[model samples]
Target: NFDEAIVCCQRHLDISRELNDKVGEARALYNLGNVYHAKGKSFEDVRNALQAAVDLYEENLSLVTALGDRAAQGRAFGNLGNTHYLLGNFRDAVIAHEQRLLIAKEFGDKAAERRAYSNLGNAYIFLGEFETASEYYKKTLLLARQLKDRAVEAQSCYSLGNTYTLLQDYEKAIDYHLKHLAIAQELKDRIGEGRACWSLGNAYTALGNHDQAMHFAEKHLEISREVGDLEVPPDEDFFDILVKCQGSRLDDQRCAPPSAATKGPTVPDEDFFSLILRSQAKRMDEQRV
Candidate 1:
């Protein structure tokens, strides 16, 4: 989409600029912002485009507000929240989302309220403020249940389990995971069920039920196979995905043990592959942008 989209948006922007129409120009910029946002653009690239979009949206909001269109400005705040989130500016994201929430509540839009609360909750989770995150997510879950939006409730359940797992509360984590699992099972969400299975595996492992953990883990793999995809990495990529080993001449492969005449395994965490795996996962998540 970005391929043709970028060209079309650029042409639109050029034409809008030539017309001396500020509203059209702003709309063009907004479209161009979405074009840049669609793919694997770098964080700085996405951040810049998103900020441009935010500025233009805010200008339009001011224009609309002067025109007495009070409802129009919520979109500008929502766009600002999205941009702030992509830039790792969670405090501003929360503030912007809160503004959007206020607008939604005033308009009595239940779905928008759910989304705003969930977005705030996600930002707080990333900020490592779990207590507030839980409160926001609870609001989201409440809205979902009231609306009978099963998928939203399932996602909220999964997220609660994920939070409890991070908090080292295995029992509560398991409870939430099971709730997620039932919903996923009853929906076309095999991937969701797969993730819940894995979570349950981790919870049971933490509870010292190794055999039960294995059962859940094996079931996760089974589900992954049924979906014709590996939930995690393919086995072949596992070694190179973590760390690339290089020879003196720039050959890259897995690290190898040294013969007496040559170099040795230069990789760290030799005693336990689990340590290396955890480090790799942490690195991957941090660099997810």
Candidate 2:
């Protein structure tokens, strides 16, 4: 199936090149990369696909930079960063995200800036730079507050809490997780609430507070049951495709690139590219019409 998809993408790429549609060519390349990623038959296959994606995105970034299309450059950098992250090239991810952050600030795109910060935080965390990661997460939190985006605010707190936990700062972790829990409750986000409670329980356990730990653990279980006992699957393959499809639809509707990007390292890996690809594809279709 993905072989067919790859052929289709290749055809599109050829046509785009022949017609001198640079943007279309970039998109086709991205689609090809996504299809290969989805195939993911082997580690080598996935890494090669992601590497190809990084290369193509870099090409697009250069093209957009020359055209002075700041928005397109930001998107290119974001995708490039994500591809690099998937490749476990954290330093490259950081570089790409830093560029994205710079562009977002220059364009005064607060939401994009927040996303860049969050992504940088993720990359730094992987690089074992907890302090730097926390700093970026703090920036993400501040921007989320300024934007009044409660879901993102909760996520920022959760990320910061985890970062503090990694740093063995259980008190700070608990404080942030409590904020996350309260926000999740206010938003009535059952899943978020459960996750926060689980995190809080871990922090309490780390602090040698068995009573507090049990209290949060019990709350976590209650929330989980209320949410129909939703559980994370040990095998991620099935969910990867599902999340890609769902994340793309949600991203298309919301037009919030960062939220799509935030769906974990692998969950929405292709969603960001798909969001732009679909919109661009639609625009191309309309032009022909």
Candidate 3:
């Protein structure tokens, strides 16, 4: 199926190139790059796919810039940033995301701006710039609150909490994780709630607070059971789809109902937290030795 998809994309790319259709050519390349990334299996394959995606997105950016399509240009930059992130090129990811942030600000698209901030935070975290990452996440949190986007706000809190954890600022980490947990509970986002609990548990453990750690670990276990346990693997593709669905809901209030309606029955929440919780407990036990 991926082979067929590749061939089809190549044909489209060829036709667009022959017709001098820059936009079409860019789109085809983007599709081809995505297909290659999705079908990648090994490290070499993934690296090649991401490299192709980076090149394709660069071409897309050039075409969009020439056409004066600000929105398309922003998207191209965002995709390029994400591809670079996947390739572990944090510096390049930061560069692309900065351009995306600029374009988002230029258009007064608060949602896009928030996303850019969040992406930059992720890139900075990977680059070991924890303080800078927290700053960007704080910006994202402020924007999310201004937009009344509870989900983004919760995620921003989660990101900030993790960033603080990396900095060994456990008190600040606990505070942010608590904020995330409160928001998740309010939203009835079971998966998010479970993750927050798991995070809190780890933070407590790191602080040598055994009772608090045990309490959160129990809360996480309860939530995991409520969500039907961890049968489904926490695959990246599935999470990507879930995140996209969440994004769409944030973009359009009208389109939210159907997805929200189907979410309860259709979406099987994965319990990746449980596995990590087990590892965390094992580490805690080892520390007592």
Candidate 4:
């Protein structure tokens, strides 16, 4: 629980202040605030914790700005933007991120700059500014490519794919997601690979290619199994997929997301087999009639 985190935070805060270490103090405060913001919170408590983090980060900005610690300032602004975004304040989040972007630019921090563009794109998408979001995504991709960061480039491709899906550009979506999938698989990013597989299933299904859709669906199931669903104790959906999907595709059954026929988590609580006996009996009776 937060009891341990709280104790650690208080001790760190005390040490930071006792040494008159403003940087250390600001960092400690921000981190401690994050503890509450992410974990120990009701709705109101979460808001307060996030706000506290933002406030502490403001102090961080103040302490660093004079030294032209543009990296620290960019980081603080990014954290502030995250806080604002969590509250669904899209415009505010954008402003915070923009400030972060400006700081990144000032220092020529390409890494931070790419992240800022990505965050800016997400905020714009949240605000329903698709065109603007697309532009930011393009910039993010360019930066990511320039930096030669395969992970960020893959992420950029994934982000572009998602936006394309929303725009109903199926062809473009698949093209982008394929790029993401290739990188994810190469990197052994199971979760990312699974997601890309699922997205491909969605794309192929939309195009009425049941076989290819099923193929990807089975691939998604395999990746999910390999990743091991994180929820402790395991969800029932886990077992359902294990048995129903057998972690593989049916001979003729096309892969698909749970819908009218495929509906249910990979594992489901439904007693699917029990209905078979009754259906068999009905078939015999109809034959006699």
Against the reference, the lDDT scores of all candidates come to 0.65, 0.71, 0.73, 0.68
Q: List the residue pairs that clash in candidate 3.
A: none
Which one wins by lDDT: 2 or 3? 3
TM-score of each: 0.71, 0.74, 0.77, 0.67
- lDDT per residue as tens, model 4, 1-289: 6668867987998999999987777778667767755652343566766676667667767776765676777777888788787777888899999998998888898988988898888887767676787788889889988998888788778778767666667788789889888888777766566667777786676678899888997887675554443332122233223334333554322232333122222111122222222333465589996
Which window of 10 residues has the lowest lDDT sum in candidate 2?
264-273
lDDT of 1: 0.65
**Deviation (Å) of 174 in candidate 4:** 0.6
lDDT of 3 by residue, 1-289 (tens): 7778889999999999999998898789778867765655333666876787777778767877888888888888888888888788999999999999999999998999998998898888778788998999999999989999887788888888877877779899999889878878887877677567767887898899999998987786666545442332222322212322322443311112222222221112222233333444566689996
The runs of at least 3 residues in candidate 4 whose Cα sits more than 4 Å from the true structure, single-residue gaps closed, are 1-44, 59-69, 229-289
For this target, which candidate reaches the highest lDDT against the unseen true structure? 3
RMSD to true structure for each model, in Å:
11.1, 14.5, 9.0, 11.4
Q: Model 3: how far is 162 from its true place, Å?
A: 0.7
Over the stretch 1-289, how does candidate 2's per-residue lDDT look in tens digits? 8678888999999999999997788778667756655554344656777777677677767776776788887887888788788888999999989999999999899999999998998888778788988999999999999998887888888888877877779899899888878878887766566566767786787788999998987776565444432323122222223222533343212112222222322111111222223443566589995
Residue 75 error for model 1, in Å?
A: 1.3
